[PDB]
Symmetry: D2
Subunit: 244 residues, 4 copies
């Protein structure tokens, strides 16, 4: 059984992961840190892997310590840039046996969904994204939808644009344009989080739908990442490569 | 056994209805007119009901003749304004046994779907419409989606608006506003014509989806209208009242 | 504001309805009874309407008292037969101003869904039902699905059967037969309760889908019934007539 | 620029592929054979690739000739057993530059859908397949659904079975069992061919849906196979490996 530490243990996600690690028989909780706890608590407790959902301003310092001490890191904290990835990559040159996974989404369905979308995108004339959320959601479209449409568009570099004969419309009917890909945002009481990618070509359509029916649906992807992170030395960006 | 005439018999929809009337055992084709044929061909053939898919510039003159001679009319021709409806209603006062049905949708699935949407609308916090069509379609949103959202909005008079906390958006993300109801138009190769109405309230959602997989799916609604139109004297707007719901 | 009592106040549903009535500004909780409390508590507190989710063995006695004292009843308790409806009908002859609503389902979406299904059934060649539930569900198909298929079949009396050319099949592929209507039951981790009715005819299909994303989704139908029950004197069976 | 022959040129699928090859600018029709035409017509016309949709009783003899003369083969003909596959593999050892693709589905949407299903299968507690077809369909479940469920089951070797507390059921409610995966077959007028794979785990679900709205939707997959088959020497089973995923 692996020894797992949690950074950000009192936060919304951290406290959830503490409970998840305690429930899982194969993972033993080795340390549980929040703000102001020294990172040496992780080595004092023989931690092998850490789950980090902290804050963009502290995650770089934490990562330096972790990599330095041979502690694998599963990181959900956001605010990662190209420069930050570089820096992490450089720290790992010194520590070739250490694995760091930095991912913006740990829901397995969402991760598979994005990957399927990217793989299918080149074979169809048309692609559109539809996302549906509860009406308390502030941003339209969602981050996941906009990220998905950007991947689709990138996979479609050098294909013709979506065919569209629209010559009379009310404004807004055709959705938002995200790198040439229409994205539609439905806001409906009674929903949680849902996303459909639609692909079409004469004669056939393909749809990939992800439905998240509770806020904690990301937990198994984080546990999966903890159980597998050591299979890939160095930096992995996104959960997809651990899934393979 | 009914005697049925078709006006617009060489058009896309007219020629299709000619074939449909000929196939149906209980309906006899009595006349088949296109542009330049005199309307007296209808009475020379003892027409009881006419199916009219012509053009907004000729339908009012055809209707006057039909109503005047007691010939029931099933009309799919568009461009009908509130004033034109009022005018047809006024002609019928003189001819109280004549029936005229004017309808923008004859597909039974689409008609049912609109009627369900109107009935469900008062009972949910949220309503939205999604329509999906082949990418050769000129208008967004479609006439059917816009008409549906208008019915939903009318059924929701005096309820709060759709709840929406959206404070950051890219333009167009939330669709087009049709009388307070968002409408989203997907344009996708490989589709024909598709519409979903979504209703929601905390804890549950209800969805009504109509899929039309061929362009002639409207034919049974028109035949149904022809078979039933005489049951309702006067002007009927929309196919729903003849459905006997 | 109406004065509402709850019978079965300590039960799963009752305790939920107590909270719902207390939250609603227009409804004032007048009495809150469980097993062993005398029904005179309802009249002592000037109750106008009672919500009753008790048990089939006690609901008939409760109903007699309620009807006798001019207290409208919204009843979710099950185990109602033709004889029991008759008996209720006869008690109401004496009390023509009293309203009693007995309903097997208070989720508005489920009630509308069944009604739409019944109204559409005669216009299509084919009808099938698909229901999807979490895998902890004991019964397949669900009660709602089987009830829905029976209504569809009744609305289809005197039409031809569903066309089906199936001549080679694995057994079970075509679902369960409920009065000539195929019903399919999906059991999937991550679902709550979902039902689709599918109708088809050459050239077109119509689908009516109900999704319940939490166990308390019936609450607004019960509150709706409490707010409207007085609009119909006598016995109403099912929530549909109050919706109209 | 490739020279493409069609075997089975008068059949339903063969005649359709003849027209598709003629329309494509980069493929030249080199020969067009039906039953009773000698195979030497293929070599007399300098055929590089053949599309074969014939009949399980003739395809093995055709394949022998093709492989022997270095002609790549894209084969949609069914009735291929494990032993026949092994036999084709054995012929190709002698002809290491020849490529043969044998595939039960050429619709790109269907092929992708199966591949996604296989990739998602290990990561969810539950998997089920729903297929929907027009009511003239003879087999339930369809070959595609059964093949899909078999792939899912194989990807799930060594995981627990689908959780299911069902203790009371009407027969058939839970579908057909195909290697531990429930498959449900809907037969509905107005449909063509449709398949959904559903995966679930506490808190989330993932659905992959393929809709084919016409019977010729397989044509681009066959053309894609013809254009790429030479990239993979030897026997390829299924279209997926040529998709370059
Ligand atoms: N990738 C994903 O799937 C995903 C999903 C949700 C949230 N997030 C991200 O994860 C992060 C956490 O989200 P949250 O909602 O739980 O935030 P939160 O503010 O509720 O929790 C963060 C916790 O980290 C603690 N913390 C801060 N600095 C620390 C340090 N140096 N050492 C130990 N603990 C420290 C804080 O005291 C706090 O308790 C955010 O950056 C958010 O954007 C990612
Ligand atoms: C709906 O229904 C209408 C028709 O649909 P469509 O796609 O078949 O149109 P269409 O243009 O294909 O044909 C309509 C037909 O009406 C005919 N017509 C014109 N004047 C006429 C007259 N006085 N009497 C009889 N026929 C006459 C035209 O010749 C034409 O064949 C449109 O308004 C459409 O939007
Ligand atoms: N129609 C619907 O939508 C729907 C939905 C769920 C449950 N139900 C039905 O409603 C009933 C209640 O369900 P539950 O899960 O809350 O059951 P429960 O056993 O949790 O609650 C029943 C409560 O009623 C109380 N009770 C019994 N006799 C009483 C009396 N004479 N006076 C006052 N209280 C009394 C019990 O003490 C208990 O607390 C069941 O019959 C069930 O089948 C209906
Ligand atoms: C798949 O693909 C296959 C064909 O599909 P279909 O619907 O077109 O079948 P189909 O029966 O319509 O036609 C197949 C064609 O193969 C032809 N054929 C038979 N022997 C041949 C030979 N030796 N050389 C060349 N052609 C020959 C037949 O004449 C026929 O035209 C089936 O096995 C199906 O299940």
């Amino acid at each position: 059984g692996m020894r797992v530490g949690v950074l950000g243990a009192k936060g919304k996600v951290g406290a959830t992961m503490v409970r998840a690690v305690a429930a899982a028989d194969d993972l033993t909780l080795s340390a549980e840190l929040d703000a102001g706890d020294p990172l040496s608590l992780l080595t004092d407790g023989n931690t092998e892997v850490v789950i980090d959902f902290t804050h963009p301003d502290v995650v770089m310092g934490n990562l330096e310590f972790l990599i330095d001490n041979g502690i694998h890191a599963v990181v959900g904290t956001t605010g990662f840039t190209a420069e930050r990835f570089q820096q992490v990559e450089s720290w790992l040159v010194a520590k070739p046996n250490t694995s760091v996974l930095i991912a913006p989404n740990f829901a397995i369905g969402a991760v598979l969904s994005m990957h399927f979308a990217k793989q299918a995108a080149r074979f169809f004339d048309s692609a559109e994204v539809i996302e549906l959320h509860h009406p308390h959601k502030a941003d339209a479209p969602s981050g996941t939808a906009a990220r998905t449409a950007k991947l689709i568009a990138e996979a479609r570099k050098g294909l013709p644009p979506n065919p569209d004969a629209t010559s009379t419309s009310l404004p807004g009917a055709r959705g938002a344009d995200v790198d040439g890909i229409p994205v539609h945002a439905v806001r409906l009481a009674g929903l949680v989080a849902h996303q459909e990618v639609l692909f079409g070509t004469e004669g056939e359509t393909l749809t990939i739908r992800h439905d998240s029916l509770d806020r904690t649906s990301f937990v198994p992807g984080v546990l999966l990442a903890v159980r597998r992170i050591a299979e890939r030395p160095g930096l992995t960006v996104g959960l997809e490569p651990l899934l393979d």
